[PDB]
A paper describes a structure:
Myosins are molecular motors that move or move along filamentous actin (F-actin). Myosins comprise a motor domain, which can be divided into four subdomains (N-terminal, upper 50-kDa (U50), lower 50-kDa (L50) and converter), a light chain-binding domain and a tail region. Primed myosin, with ADP and Pi bound, rebinds F-actin, leading to Pi release, cleft closure and generation of movement, proposedly through swinging of the lever (power stroke), towards the barbed end of F-actin (+actin)13 for most myosins. Here, to address these issues, we performed time-resolved cryogenic electron microscopy (cryo-EM)4 of a myosin-5 mutant having slow hydrolysis product release.
We thereby obtained a structure of primed actomyosin at 4.4 Å global resolution, which reveals how the myosin motor interacts with F-actin in its primed state to initiate force generation. In the primed state, myosin interacts with actin through its L50 domain with its actin-binding cleft open. The central actomyosin interface is formed between two neighbouring actin subunits and the myosin helix–loop–helix (HLH) motif, with additional interactions between actin and myosin loop 2 and myosin loop 3 completing the interface. The interactions between the HLH and actin and those between loop 3 and actin are the same as observed for the strong-binding states, largely conserved across myosin classes in higher eukaryotes. Thus, the orientation of the primed motor domain when docked onto actin resembles that of strongly bound states except that the U50 does not interact with actin in primed actomyosin. The converter is in a primed position within the motor domain, and the orientation of the motor domain on actin results in the emerging lever helix pointing along the actin axis towards the pointed end, at an angle of about 52° to the actin axis. Modelling in ISOLDE showed that the actin residues D1 and E2 can interact with H637 and N641 in helix W, respectively, and the acetyl group of the acetylated N-terminal residue D1 can interact with H631 in loop 2. In the bound state, with myosin anchored to actin through the HLH, the rest of the L50 moves downwards, relative to the actin axis, so that the U50 domain is rotated circumferentially around F-actin towards the converter, which lifts the HCM loop and loop 4 further away from the actin surface. Consequently, in the primed actomyosin model, refined with MD in ISOLDE28, the ADP is placed further back into the pocket, towards helix D, creating strain that may promote Pi dissociation from the ADP moiety as the Pi is anchored by interactions with the P-loop (S165), helix F (K169) and switch 1 (N214 and S218). The loops of switch 1 and switch 2 are in such close proximity in the density map that in our model the salt bridge between R219 in switch 1 and E442 in switch 2, termed the backdoor, is still present and so the exit door is closed.
Numbering used by the authors:
A (entry chain C), C (entry chain D): 5 to 375
B (entry chain B): 2 to 376
D (entry chain A): 2 to 593, 598, 628 to 774
The structure:
Amino acid sequence: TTALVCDNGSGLVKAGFAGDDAPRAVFPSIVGRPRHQGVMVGMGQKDSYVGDEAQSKRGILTLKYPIEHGIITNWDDMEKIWHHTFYNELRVAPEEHPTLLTEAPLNPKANREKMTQIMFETFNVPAMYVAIQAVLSLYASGRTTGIVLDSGDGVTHNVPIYEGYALPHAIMRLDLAGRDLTDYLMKILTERGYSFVTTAEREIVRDIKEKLCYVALDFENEMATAASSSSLEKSYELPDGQVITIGNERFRCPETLFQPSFIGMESAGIHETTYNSIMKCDIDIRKDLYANNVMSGGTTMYPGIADRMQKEITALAPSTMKIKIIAPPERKYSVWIGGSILASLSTFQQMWITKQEYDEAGPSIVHRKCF
Amino acid sequence: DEDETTALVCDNGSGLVKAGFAGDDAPRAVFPSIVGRPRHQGVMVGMGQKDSYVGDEAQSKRGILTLKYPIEHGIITNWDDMEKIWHHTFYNELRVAPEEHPTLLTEAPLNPKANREKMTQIMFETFNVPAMYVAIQAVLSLYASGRTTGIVLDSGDGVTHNVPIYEGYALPHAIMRLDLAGRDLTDYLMKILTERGYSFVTTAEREIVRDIKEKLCYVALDFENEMATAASSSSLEKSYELPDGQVITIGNERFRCPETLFQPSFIGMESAGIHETTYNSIMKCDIDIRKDLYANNVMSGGTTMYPGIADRMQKEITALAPSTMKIKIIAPPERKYSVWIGGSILASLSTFQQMWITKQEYDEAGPSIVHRKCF
Amino acid sequence: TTALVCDNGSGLVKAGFAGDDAPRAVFPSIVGRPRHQGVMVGMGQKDSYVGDEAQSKRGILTLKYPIEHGIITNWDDMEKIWHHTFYNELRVAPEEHPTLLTEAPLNPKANREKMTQIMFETFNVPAMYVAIQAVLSLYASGRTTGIVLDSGDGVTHNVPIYEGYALPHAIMRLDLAGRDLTDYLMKILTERGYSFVTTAEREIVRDIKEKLCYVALDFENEMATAASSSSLEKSYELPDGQVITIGNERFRCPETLFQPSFIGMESAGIHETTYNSIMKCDIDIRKDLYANNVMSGGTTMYPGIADRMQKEITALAPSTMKIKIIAPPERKYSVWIGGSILASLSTFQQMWITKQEYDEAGPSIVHRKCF
Amino acid sequence: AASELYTKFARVWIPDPEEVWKSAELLKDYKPGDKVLLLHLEEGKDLEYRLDPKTGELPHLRNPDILVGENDLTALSYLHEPAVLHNLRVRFIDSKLIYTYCGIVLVAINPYEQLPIYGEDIINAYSGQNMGDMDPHIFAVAEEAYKQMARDERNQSIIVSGESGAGKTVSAKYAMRYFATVSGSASEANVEEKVLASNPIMESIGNAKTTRNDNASRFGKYIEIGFDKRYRIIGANMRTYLLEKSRVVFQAEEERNYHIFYQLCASAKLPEFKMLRLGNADSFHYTKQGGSPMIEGVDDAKEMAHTRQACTLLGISESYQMGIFRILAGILHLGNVGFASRDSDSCTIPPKHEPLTIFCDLMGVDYEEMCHWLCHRKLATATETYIKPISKLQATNARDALAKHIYAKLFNWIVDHVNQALHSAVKQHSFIGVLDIYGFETFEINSFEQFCINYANEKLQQQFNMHVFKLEQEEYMKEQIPWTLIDFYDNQPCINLIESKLGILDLLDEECKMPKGTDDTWAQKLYNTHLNKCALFEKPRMSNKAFIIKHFADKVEYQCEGFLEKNKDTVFEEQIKVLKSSKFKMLPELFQAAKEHKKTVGHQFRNSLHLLMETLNATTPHYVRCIKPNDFKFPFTFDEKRAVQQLRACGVLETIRISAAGFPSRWTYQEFFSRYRVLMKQKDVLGDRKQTCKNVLEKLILDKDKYQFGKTKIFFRAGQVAYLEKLRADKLRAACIRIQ
Ligand SMILES: Nc1ncnc2c1ncn2[C@@H]1O[C@H](COP(=O)(O)OP(=O)(O)O)[C@@H](O)[C@H]1O
Ligand SMILES: Nc1ncnc2c1ncn2[C@@H]1O[C@H](COP(=O)(O)OP(=O)(O)O)[C@@H](O)[C@H]1O
Ligand SMILES: Nc1ncnc2c1ncn2[C@@H]1O[C@H](COP(=O)(O)OP(=O)(O)O)[C@@H](O)[C@H]1O
Ligand SMILES: Nc1ncnc2c1ncn2[C@@H]1O[C@H](COP(=O)(O)OP(=O)(O)O)[C@@H](O)[C@H]1O
Ligand SMILES: [Mg+2]
Ligand SMILES: [Mg+2]
Ligand SMILES: [Mg+2]
Ligand SMILES: [Mg+2]
């Protein structure tokens, strides 16, 4: 049977068959709920909407995320998303296809047990396995040694790996992710007078962010260039047909990854976390991690993030170390691909907790199998 | 002092401007920001209709002229009319020379850089002010409260804002501006009086509805209880005498109108209620300081002058927060007049006399000096 | 004149006069520093806060330790701690009161020299002495023979002593200390859904650690009790009044001392190091060390550590050897008490390095005198 | 050149560890470059004294024994510290001459004894003199000021400047007595009798026992003695100043309160005081803390009889006296009202308390209402006057704030009453102003009052350092007359630290204005502002609530505790309401009287002081510097360390230096041309009046060292103006006889 693979994404869910190089399904995790009143008697009106059919009704609906900070916010809405892929999108049955799931490291034990309980009972899946999102993108990098930095919409984590063996004292996690960069963009656009208040506008700001924002090679140089030349200033057309101006915001927004003091965090910048994790690794494997830094996730997709990261790490590390940054053409599309690769292996077919195993051994079996 | 003339304190109120001298206990001047323009027709042979009227002169001519606000949503709508107000302030009410005296202005946080740079440019170029400072309204309300720690909710006519303050420090992530303010409550009262049968259609009538609002409206302790009481007893129903000498009835509109602060769904907003924004900002603050903000909630600005609002705020925050926390709501008398008083307290300090952007600093450094001194 | 005695404590500094029953001063060494922006005009503010004045402004300031791994991190910050001690807390001049200091063995020569250079110049002390922290707590214990295990916040060390004569080929020093147990607690609480990121939260976790954690007599039995009966589960209210649950973490965190592999540390457990140091001693004195094990320092203050240590050493040692674990009241202050006793001896006042000795003979006189 | 004088047998001044300076007869002649100097000390011992090898600089040379003990230190051949200290030392110990001159300054020494020299034939001795015709005395200073008024119509002032025990109080009294007795030829003797009789009243209500002076004068008093065109006294205006308020409530174990309270206690045996039911001095807080209700060598009942006679001489009715006495007994009865804490922020008083019973009875006030306002307070909000209970500490503060206020109200009444009794004509021709003020003060604790009185002395020394030195040298430079610039202590900085926009009292007023201003926070604000910069101010190492400032005399450490509250000086309205409601008639009169500035003590006082110093500087000034010889208060006991410190704090050495340089008299060329035209010959006068003045002064004074010339002025030494006036009188007389 075609083993199904699914990346549970904080802002964007992806799913498909094992062996495919690309997910068959890719849609927003955000759901929708109407407001105002009943337009007419009946009229095919729904009490809830999912993904693109919620995005087409922005401002009529209130948008809700089933995931925040890597963990599930509402299990009914996550069950709604799972069902939408299985029957409405992929048009298959979970009770016929083994389904691989994946989550962030240092995720609560209760989050995983409840996730597996729903999948094994509500969807009666025949077999199931839970992967860590960071190891899958390193499998797509096709290397056994490499420090992977994975930054999504809702969570961020850095994982040093050597010969296929992670270091559980040196692995890290960061509260800062792409959602906070969107909230920051709204505040720095408010400094011009552009005040936003609804989730309908937040999605247009999230687009503006992905279209126009970039990472500075030297923050001061870009700040002086914006003030002196004004050449970094651009325009953008909103859905009502009005234009708005944007320029300083393009570099200030992504600089938060390196300066979390912008949003008031005491936390260190992404470059520091990767460097400190190498310093927490054994001195013999440090060089090989320096030659194998791996960017992953949608937030790492940013113009100039790799040149700045190389510069920032070269400034901290010894001058004899060959600092190398691997930045896959698609960093968001890498965790799913690793899952599709992993699920295709004949040797991995034993690592699939079965329905019978789960029912006999109880929910804690998933943590005994993974660890 | 003896050897030194005053500095001038002025609050830029959206419906009501207040000004006076540093160290006075109340503003020597308080008048509507409203500017009026003749919307009538030819009547007198020697018609002395002043092109424009200001404050009281405009209020005494409601229906003969139209009423324009120089401020909407915390920001300036027309700078010529704001220059006209500043003129009336220092050349009629206080009747001074602004050329000789330092002047303090004040505005809402999260305000456009342009709305502040243009404000300082006009005051230095057209009023030759020797030195000036731009304060945040919320910090002046906290100074009048007389504490170093408190979460201040400041709701005016044209804007509402919420800034939690711990010790001599601010938290930039917990600042929360709100689009809902006392003007929207007036427009909502007109809608629910229209639902009864009283249709109002002009700024001259809107000012009578704003009076009715401030005289008769109150905040419910439990909305449902007040809805049931109004329907069952009719005891909340009262009468009001309009300027033509006719009477109108009002009762359910007394609690439905202020309830919009706790239920913005009344006007169609997705936005959270005033209690929710204050609570969420405490949860965005550090855990060690949440308790001291929970015991120091501070009400400020003219939209807080509603009967029952402090007791309701307490109940609402006590329902959200852990029951072990001592929820306290500070509501000082004259909440609308607390920002000015705080500006007067600040301006009375001698170590603050050097914190003013001077005419020489402006000329040499250009308008961005205000965002390099105050900001 | 009276002498002063001072314990340079990694996480807690203590000071007082010679011959007193307890230190006059005991406060955190953590030096605070503003990381927030001010808004009140006219407030008594400083660029650096100390001890309880840093703790009373948590979150608003960032907390920095002047000591890590028993070695000074910043000399200016340690100079500000000595300043606060002499003029703000003790209210007496060092220029008149001789000041005994104390540090961990296997500490760099430069750490001792720069410490004594600062004291002899900036504080113009007349006389000074540098003791080893381990011998002082054995003096408080009142024995000439014993194996002292001293575990602080920032360093752990082990010293077999016979008839007042340490065995320098047998002495040990474990990097693992009470700070790592706090970092471990934060990681094992994140699995229960309790994520922490700032030094302000780390101090609340430290309080939770000292209040609720205990050492297991049999680790497996406590895991089985937590899973089967759950009676080990307690609760804790936070500064903001919200409650949190804690149970398995109460025995998992102190168990790291016996199993450093818990985070991923390839060193032997505390019992193994004490046993190996007895094996590095001559057989004739081993029996007397086996009956004179001495617990010392704030990390040994865990409920159930003495009986477990007795069990673990009885399993390693010959069955004929009488295994005894001495674990007095006020174990973290025993080092200070030993220093006071030393500085009161009429036959020790000739061992103090004088300001003259330092000036004429240069900074290395400290090593020549102490050793 | 001076190196030639250090020959064999040349007594000098070697620095002494204990005696400050020791004399040494040279045993050898200093050879050019003799860094070693064999000398012989007066103890009979030889020494090889050594010089500074960077300079070869020699010790101060001793004046010849013939010049020792002179009437003015300018008469010495050598002008230095050892000389001026030694001359004052031998005079006080041997000659008993407590008075010596330093040019314009008269130096005055406390003998700790009556020397009852004074008498009518001494008034006759100084009558008709010129200065220097008779010896140094406050009587000559008073006679000279009187002459200066009588000859030129100018206004005058007498300024005292001494330590808290240096004769400055009674020296000013004897000088005032001089004016009163010289004017005693007039038939209005009772006006001068009232001027004298005002002082024992002011002493009883304003002087008290300190560890420094047993009759320390705790307020200041400038008097303005007015005179007519016959130069006879018409009366005197009193202008009193700041009076201590903590003296009324707190007394140190070695100090006392204002004497009036202890005089009242001694008087309690008479039926008029048995009516006020007055207790003994151990019954009241405001009398008992001093521990000694009687001073040695006095009787408080004798002093009470004196004050009652002085009131009768001032025309103050026994009824007014009895009214003030009832009020003073009322202050004592309030000072021991009982308080019993409740809750924590609450406190009740006994409805049977006897002191409280006689208190409300003597004021004629409702017990219940007095109690209500002593247990509860009114909120400052104008829209809702809601009540708030007060703690035992706040209720104790309300007792003491009320007692302080009532004392002010009655002191201000007395000084207004004496000014009505000392009535004078609507315009005076000319006036002389004697001034007396509290002196420099230190104790083991120093507070806002010490800060104020030391700043007042700082301002007095400042004006002196200007008129005598700074302004004088500027006059010379402006008139372009050959002159050498003078060195002096500029204490104007010790003033800019207090007066300027970031200064101590301005920051004290800010932390009074701010509701979160508080003790540590102000002290820390000073630390944040001034330790980083200024020379004069420091923090002590160990003390963390204290600060130390250098003054003209010496450094004084003020404690930050008790600063903001004494600067605020607030009083409970709820208590002033019931006092204004008193059925006793006196108390309602005492409690009855487009922008504003609200004023603290620090503001109010600095203004009062600027006004005073401007009205002094408008006159022609005279300066006496008072010196204390031993803290032991032992009679005729001269301590060298004590005196050398006092004379360097005043700057006596530099005053002698500038008065030895001479040339204080000045006349414009045209003024000399008009005044001494009778001395000018019709062939010697020219169209250039400058040359005319030069041509005649060349003939009139042969000694070229006594006169100088300026751009538009002519300069002259002491006494030379009196010689020119004697020539003017004699020549006018001869001319009148010649044309007869
Ligand atoms: N080109 C881009 N530029 C900036 N941000 C991007 C870009 N592509 C994706 N992102 C951000 O990455 C997140 C979504 O990427 P993805 O890794 O697929 O999310 P998820 O965590 O839901 O799987 C959002 O925060 C989005 O704004
Ligand atoms: N007693 C009251 N009842 C109701 N609304 C009030 C009352 N007092 C003031 N307001 C409202 O508050 C606003 C004016 O108060 P103020 O704080 O001075 O506003 P601003 O400073 O923004 O001009 C107006 O919307 C006015 O209607
Ligand atoms: N009663 C206790 N229970 C558990 N841990 C404790 C206890 N007392 C101290 N600790 C821990 O031990 C360390 C304190 O050791 P201490 O002797 O104070 O070291 P130092 O004096 O070198 O700073 C810290 O990690 C602290 O959290
Ligand atoms: N010439 C003098 N004749 C008599 N007594 C004198 C004389 N000079 C000083 N005294 C005495 O000196 C003492 C102190 O004088 P006083 O004026 O009180 O000092 P001060 O005001 O400087 O503290 C008094 O007892 C006073 O009688
Ligand atoms: Mg992802
Ligand atoms: Mg307002
Ligand atoms: Mg220790
Ligand atoms: Mg005196």
